[PDB]
Design an enzyme around this catalytic site. Sequence first.
Site, mmCIF file in Angstrom:
data_model
loop_
_atom_site.group_PDB
_atom_site.id
_atom_site.type_symbol
_atom_site.label_atom_id
_atom_site.label_comp_id
_atom_site.label_asym_id
_atom_site.label_seq_id
_atom_site.Cartn_x
_atom_site.Cartn_y
_atom_site.Cartn_z
ATOM 1 N N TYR B 54 24.166 13.524 -68.185
ATOM 2 C CA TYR B 54 23.214 13.777 -67.102
ATOM 3 C C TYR B 54 23.238 15.265 -66.752
ATOM 4 O O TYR B 54 24.265 15.786 -66.363
ATOM 5 C CB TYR B 54 23.480 12.904 -65.840
ATOM 6 C CG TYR B 54 22.362 11.894 -65.598
ATOM 7 C CD1 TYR B 54 21.100 12.324 -65.213
ATOM 8 C CD2 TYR B 54 22.549 10.527 -65.824
ATOM 9 C CE1 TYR B 54 20.056 11.430 -65.035
ATOM 10 C CE2 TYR B 54 21.504 9.612 -65.643
ATOM 11 C CZ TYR B 54 20.260 10.068 -65.256
ATOM 12 O OH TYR B 54 19.217 9.194 -65.083
ATOM 13 N N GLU B 56 20.502 17.108 -64.753
ATOM 14 C CA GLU B 56 19.365 17.415 -63.907
ATOM 15 C C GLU B 56 19.410 18.857 -63.433
ATOM 16 O O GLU B 56 20.456 19.357 -63.050
ATOM 17 C CB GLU B 56 19.333 16.490 -62.699
ATOM 18 C CG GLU B 56 19.036 15.034 -63.027
ATOM 19 C CD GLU B 56 19.143 14.155 -61.804
ATOM 20 O OE1 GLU B 56 20.275 13.798 -61.437
ATOM 21 O OE2 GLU B 56 18.104 13.837 -61.199
ATOM 22 N N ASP B 208 -3.927 23.515 -75.162
ATOM 23 C CA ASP B 208 -3.079 22.452 -75.736
ATOM 24 C C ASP B 208 -3.227 22.561 -77.228
ATOM 25 O O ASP B 208 -4.215 22.125 -77.782
ATOM 26 C CB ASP B 208 -3.524 21.068 -75.235
ATOM 27 C CG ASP B 208 -2.601 19.923 -75.693
ATOM 28 O OD1 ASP B 208 -1.758 20.090 -76.602
ATOM 29 O OD2 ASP B 208 -2.746 18.826 -75.112
ATOM 30 N N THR B 234 3.159 19.556 -78.225
ATOM 31 C CA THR B 234 4.135 18.605 -78.716
ATOM 32 C C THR B 234 4.936 19.246 -79.830
ATOM 33 O O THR B 234 4.464 20.165 -80.472
ATOM 34 C CB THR B 234 3.478 17.299 -79.243
ATOM 35 O OG1 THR B 234 2.575 17.576 -80.311
ATOM 36 C CG2 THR B 234 2.754 16.595 -78.137
ATOM 37 N N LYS B 237 4.180 16.796 -84.222
ATOM 38 C CA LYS B 237 3.101 16.701 -85.191
ATOM 39 C C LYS B 237 3.324 17.736 -86.314
ATOM 40 O O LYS B 237 4.336 17.652 -87.039
ATOM 41 C CB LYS B 237 1.775 16.868 -84.491
ATOM 42 C CG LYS B 237 1.569 15.930 -83.339
ATOM 43 C CD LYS B 237 0.255 16.244 -82.662
ATOM 44 C CE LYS B 237 -0.013 15.225 -81.584
ATOM 45 N NZ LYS B 237 1.022 15.279 -80.539
ATOM 46 N N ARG B 243 10.068 13.853 -81.118
ATOM 47 C CA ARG B 243 9.078 13.553 -80.086
ATOM 48 C C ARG B 243 9.498 14.215 -78.757
ATOM 49 O O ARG B 243 10.402 13.757 -78.111
ATOM 50 C CB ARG B 243 8.852 12.044 -79.924
ATOM 51 C CG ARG B 243 8.427 11.384 -81.233
ATOM 52 C CD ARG B 243 8.072 9.905 -81.083
ATOM 53 N NE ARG B 243 6.649 9.740 -80.852
ATOM 54 C CZ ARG B 243 5.707 9.822 -81.776
ATOM 55 N NH1 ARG B 243 5.995 10.044 -83.053
ATOM 56 N NH2 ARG B 243 4.441 9.701 -81.402
HETATM 57 C C1 LIG Z 1 20.432 15.061 -58.548
HETATM 58 C C2 LIG Z 1 19.987 13.740 -57.958
HETATM 59 N N1 LIG Z 1 18.942 13.003 -58.408
HETATM 60 N N2 LIG Z 1 18.693 11.811 -57.681
HETATM 61 C C3 LIG Z 1 19.648 11.827 -56.737
HETATM 62 C C4 LIG Z 1 20.537 12.984 -56.780
HETATM 63 C C5 LIG Z 1 21.674 13.202 -55.815
HETATM 64 C C6 LIG Z 1 21.596 14.628 -55.229
HETATM 65 C C7 LIG Z 1 22.749 15.326 -54.819
HETATM 66 C C8 LIG Z 1 22.661 16.606 -54.283
HETATM 67 F F1 LIG Z 1 23.803 17.211 -53.922
HETATM 68 C C9 LIG Z 1 21.422 17.236 -54.124
HETATM 69 C C10 LIG Z 1 20.249 16.580 -54.522
HETATM 70 N N3 LIG Z 1 18.955 17.140 -54.365
HETATM 71 C C11 LIG Z 1 18.021 16.996 -55.496
HETATM 72 C C12 LIG Z 1 16.993 18.121 -55.467
HETATM 73 C C13 LIG Z 1 16.449 18.280 -54.064
HETATM 74 C C14 LIG Z 1 15.379 19.351 -54.056
HETATM 75 O O1 LIG Z 1 14.999 19.875 -55.136
HETATM 76 O O2 LIG Z 1 14.905 19.713 -52.952
HETATM 77 C C15 LIG Z 1 17.557 18.758 -53.144
HETATM 78 C C16 LIG Z 1 18.624 17.676 -53.022
HETATM 79 C C17 LIG Z 1 20.355 15.280 -55.046
HETATM 80 C C18 LIG Z 1 22.993 12.855 -56.562
HETATM 81 C C19 LIG Z 1 23.077 11.455 -57.209
HETATM 82 C C20 LIG Z 1 23.376 13.905 -57.609
HETATM 83 C C21 LIG Z 1 21.586 12.247 -54.630
HETATM 84 C C22 LIG Z 1 22.344 12.495 -53.628
HETATM 85 N N4 LIG Z 1 23.033 12.664 -52.698
HETATM 86 C C23 LIG Z 1 20.733 11.182 -54.639
HETATM 87 N N5 LIG Z 1 20.623 10.316 -53.631
HETATM 88 O O3 LIG Z 1 19.856 10.887 -55.777
HETATM 89 C C1 LIG Z 2 -3.845 17.621 -77.984
HETATM 90 C C2 LIG Z 2 -2.829 16.541 -77.681
HETATM 91 N N1 LIG Z 2 -2.054 16.686 -76.601
HETATM 92 C C3 LIG Z 2 -1.135 15.804 -76.223
HETATM 93 C C4 LIG Z 2 -0.860 14.645 -76.960
HETATM 94 C C5 LIG Z 2 0.186 13.732 -76.365
HETATM 95 O O1 LIG Z 2 1.368 13.523 -77.090
HETATM 96 P P1 LIG Z 2 2.262 12.232 -76.684
HETATM 97 O O2 LIG Z 2 1.618 11.142 -77.506
HETATM 98 O O3 LIG Z 2 3.557 12.778 -77.206
HETATM 99 O O4 LIG Z 2 2.190 11.967 -75.226
HETATM 100 C C6 LIG Z 2 -1.663 14.334 -78.184
HETATM 101 C C7 LIG Z 2 -1.431 13.089 -79.043
HETATM 102 N N2 LIG Z 2 -2.592 12.472 -79.654
HETATM 103 C C8 LIG Z 2 -2.422 11.432 -80.647
HETATM 104 C C9 LIG Z 2 -3.035 11.819 -81.971
HETATM 105 O O5 LIG Z 2 -3.603 12.919 -82.092
HETATM 106 O O6 LIG Z 2 -2.956 11.034 -82.916
HETATM 107 C C10 LIG Z 2 -2.670 15.347 -78.557
HETATM 108 O O7 LIG Z 2 -3.473 15.183 -79.630
HETATM 109 C C1 LIG Z 3 17.853 4.438 -58.779
HETATM 110 C C2 LIG Z 3 17.469 5.423 -59.863
HETATM 111 N N1 LIG Z 3 16.245 5.330 -60.401
HETATM 112 C C3 LIG Z 3 15.777 6.133 -61.344
HETATM 113 C C4 LIG Z 3 16.549 7.152 -61.913
HETATM 114 C C5 LIG Z 3 15.830 7.993 -62.949
HETATM 115 O O1 LIG Z 3 16.425 8.128 -64.216
HETATM 116 P P1 LIG Z 3 15.935 9.327 -65.190
HETATM 117 O O2 LIG Z 3 16.900 10.424 -64.861
HETATM 118 O O3 LIG Z 3 16.188 8.622 -66.502
HETATM 119 O O4 LIG Z 3 14.541 9.742 -64.876
HETATM 120 C C6 LIG Z 3 17.934 7.394 -61.411
HETATM 121 C C7 LIG Z 3 18.838 8.490 -61.962
HETATM 122 N N2 LIG Z 3 19.694 9.166 -61.011
HETATM 123 C C8 LIG Z 3 20.726 10.071 -61.476
HETATM 124 C C9 LIG Z 3 22.117 9.645 -61.062
HETATM 125 O O5 LIG Z 3 22.290 8.624 -60.380
HETATM 126 O O6 LIG Z 3 23.079 10.316 -61.434
HETATM 127 C C10 LIG Z 3 18.408 6.470 -60.358
HETATM 128 O O7 LIG Z 3 19.636 6.585 -59.814
#
Ligand SMILES: Cc1[nH]nc2c1[C@](c1cc(F)cc(N3CCC(C(=O)O)CC3)c1)(C(C)C)C(C#N)=C(N)O2
Ligand SMILES: Cc1ncc(COP(=O)(O)O)c(CNCC(=O)O)c1O
Ligand SMILES: Cc1ncc(COP(=O)(O)O)c(CNCC(=O)O)c1O
Lengths: 442, 442
Positions: B54, B56, B208, B234, B237, B243
């Site tokens: 992870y 972020e 694009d 992308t 292609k 991807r």
């Molecule tokens: C990184 C992330 N993603 N989703 C999350 C987090 C946590 C998190 C911790 C932290 F110290 C800071 C933030 N922020 C994310 C960005 C936001 C902004 O851009 O304004 C500011 C606060 C998030 C945690 C699981 C790491 C968090 C907590 N607590 C919660 N609840 O969920």
């Molecule tokens: C100009 C353009 N931009 C974005 C995408 C999006 O890519 P994702 O599928 O990764 O979301 C495509 C895909 N078009 C499919 C094709 O040309 O066969 C594209 O042709």
């Molecule tokens: C409840 C919940 N839902 C959705 C996501 C989204 O996952 P993606 O990062 O795959 O977009 C997270 C990830 N949260 C980060 C953490 O708990 O450390 C989550 O905690």
Amino acid sequence: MFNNEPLEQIDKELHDILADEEKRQRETINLIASENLTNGAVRECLGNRVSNKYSEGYPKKRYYGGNDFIDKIEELCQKRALEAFNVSDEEWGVNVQPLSGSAANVQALYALVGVKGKIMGMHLCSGGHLTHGFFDEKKKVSITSDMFESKLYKCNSQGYVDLDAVREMALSFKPKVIICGYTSYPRDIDYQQFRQICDEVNAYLFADISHISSFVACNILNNPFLHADVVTTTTHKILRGPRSALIFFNKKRNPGIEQKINSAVFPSFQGGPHNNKIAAVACQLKEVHSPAFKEYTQQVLLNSKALAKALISKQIDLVTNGTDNHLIVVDLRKFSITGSKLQETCNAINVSLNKNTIPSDVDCVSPSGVRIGTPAMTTRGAKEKDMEFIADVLARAIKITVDLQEQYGKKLVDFKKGLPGNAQLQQLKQEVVTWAGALPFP
Amino acid sequence: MFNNEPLEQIDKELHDILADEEKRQRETINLIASENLTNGAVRECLGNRVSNKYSEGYPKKRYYGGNDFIDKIEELCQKRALEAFNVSDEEWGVNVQPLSGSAANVQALYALVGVKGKIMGMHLCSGGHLTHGFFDEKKKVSITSDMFESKLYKCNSQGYVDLDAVREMALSFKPKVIICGYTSYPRDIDYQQFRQICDEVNAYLFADISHISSFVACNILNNPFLHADVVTTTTHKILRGPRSALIFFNKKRNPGIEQKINSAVFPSFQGGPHNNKIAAVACQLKEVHSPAFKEYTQQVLLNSKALAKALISKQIDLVTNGTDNHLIVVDLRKFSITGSKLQETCNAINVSLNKNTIPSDVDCVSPSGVRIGTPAMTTRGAKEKDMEFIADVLARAIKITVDLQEQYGKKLVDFKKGLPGNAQLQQLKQEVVTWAGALPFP
Ligand SMILES: Cc1[nH]nc2c1[C@](c1cc(F)cc(N3CCC(C(=O)O)CC3)c1)(C(C)C)C(C#N)=C(N)O2
Ligand SMILES: Cc1ncc(COP(=O)(O)O)c(CNCC(=O)O)c1O
Ligand SMILES: Cc1ncc(COP(=O)(O)O)c(CNCC(=O)O)c1O
Ligand SMILES: Cc1[nH]nc2c1[C@](c1cc(F)cc(N3CCC(C(=O)O)CC3)c1)(C(C)C)C(C#N)=C(N)O2
Ligand SMILES: [Cl-]
């Protein structure tokens, strides 16, 4: 007309950084609650030539031909998913195309409410996710607070979901969707009372179970499928799959939901699905539905309860004074150190965790806790008795953090200068590396 | 506490379908313009344990620790990207986190215009992408037509972008972004004249170049980086990466764009990045910036021109009467068959292509053409002289399709009944399988 040389030969620069990454993972006490370690079979799927195929659309309704085997993989993944989560294919469907958890939530919410639609979720500072409507006074931080009209509910001073305030907010706000299921919530969720509030206001019930998915599938924790209209989950945390997501939708309760969800994923948001992801998810979902995996999931909770207890025995405070699941939030206020300070100290000793808000924190600036979780270390074979050592290491880190703060001050910039070369940290690191280094590693 | 059995042992069911998929790829004349075949090194990256992390945030601005090696991979990928597309890191930045092309475009568009913002793009039916604002009378099909207010421009009756109509539309509509670069456009783009229109109405220029990215990188086609504010592409292609997707932004022209683009990707839209993707993109971008890959890209264009010429020599009409890049759109009107019928016939003979609108089509139901492209077959080692065989195979598919239509009828349901067991198709399939099976396969 291509280069088939191995990665070591073709890109020596990258292969070394990757070899270094693997060694770091091997020698780390990884307590990130959202992290795990995939097995070789899952990683064989992620590197499979199936990612070469464009297959926009859905099985048997594909835009292109040559998708017979891709349709079999996607059908096997959806089937394996509905089985893993104990739901009948006549009552529930699943979409397996969302590329990650955040994509899955934005897509699912859009399907239910559309642009300008009204949503309710837990505040980020209280343990909600970004994709549950997070915004700040200064900005609409998540697209979910900008493309939707969101309102945020809080937990009480003891760190629990306060259902009276959820209801109070729901009645005056009148959202189309109410989101429950969280990123750093240490207790189980009363979905029935969520369903009861949703009926009252005529809102949809959205359960994000990414952090607890294995507990739900294996029937250790409460089951949101009994109550929820939509269930989303990532496949890469406690489930131990690849980085992907699943959107579940209840057909019986909401006719026409299948098409709204499916069209939201494609073509509203995504293009071509990533078939390597879908294969890799298919693969893990078979493991998920085994008595062996239930044992692992049970082990995750035993370790977590045992880790909680050991920390309490060392006079460390836990938010809600314990846990019902895989994760603990440590309240650091009695030691007068911030979460970020301890995160820095733990990184210096190869201990991976993250800073985390506690109820008393009014903002997300200077969070006064850290979040730990047991799934990654339970995967590496640690049992209940090993949790004492993990508690011991974390107690020692807190003490060193207090000592360093005394010597170099409370400003984070100054504090870190105290860190490099520290004899105690080098000592503590070596103990961590020695213990972690030898644990089973997929 | 994990199963490290290989994929074949752990999930024999899935491993057979994947082995089938691999063999189908091996034995197919793949003319999907947007497809390619990744090498082993890129697939090693995609199956790497780096996806366990992870991370972020951005390099050196991460939420979590333990991201030293992840920061090195992401910085390497960004650096390699800017070099590959011949741009200075002083003037251009790149975001490498977008999970796919469609995500990249929605993120980039949101950054420039916000919710309700005004955008202009080519109509899907004229060769635009879904994410360029596509909608229909019945529905806002793309989120890019719903979260944004979009207007759609068309190509003229000869299949070229009509800049006069673009100008007429821009001056009346007044968008913040004008999108150019397409999904099925067989000619090069006059970016300078797009910039002229954008300046005249104070709109951003969005390029694009996903389909032509290699031609831009290797200085074979016009360079949108001389004129555009934003360039997306992308990586899967013609670039031949995994991807994923790339957002380039012009800092020099737009101060403050870096933070707008970066915050759009995270935390506005995405959560944790997929580090296996980023590694895999890094790996391909090194290859992209090599004189050997320029030769491949040149070969793609030589094969395409030669394929165009051979189809014309067999009296087959091409939209715009030719090509400047990797793709051709065949106009099937003189044979009185639809693209969907020929696609079905070509799948039956292991020839992969897709149905495609032509200018005279008013709807996206019953498109009157097909799209073909040379990157996948150029990757497999086909040279100019091999394009005559591909042309011969496609001409025979068209003739069989006309004959089947005569025997069974113009309704697609009735037409397909004619395909199974057809003696000529089985014969034509066997020739395709024999030629395709033999070609080099990464
Ligand atoms: C990184 C992330 N993603 N989703 C999350 C987090 C946590 C998190 C911790 C932290 F110290 C800071 C933030 N922020 C994310 C960005 C936001 C902004 O851009 O304004 C500011 C606060 C998030 C945690 C699981 C790491 C968090 C907590 N607590 C919660 N609840 O969920
Ligand atoms: C100009 C353009 N931009 C974005 C995408 C999006 O890519 P994702 O599928 O990764 O979301 C495509 C895909 N078009 C499919 C094709 O040309 O066969 C594209 O042709
Ligand atoms: C409840 C919940 N839902 C959705 C996501 C989204 O996952 P993606 O990062 O795959 O977009 C997270 C990830 N949260 C980060 C953490 O708990 O450390 C989550 O905690
Ligand atoms: C599949 C896809 N994605 N992006 C694309 C396409 C193309 C396409 C061909 C086609 F025959 C149909 C469609 N539709 C997509 C869905 C849409 C809807 O749901 O309302 C109906 C029309 C798209 C093509 C490259 C395969 C296409 C063309 N021509 C263009 N320009 O871009
Ligand atoms: Cl992937």
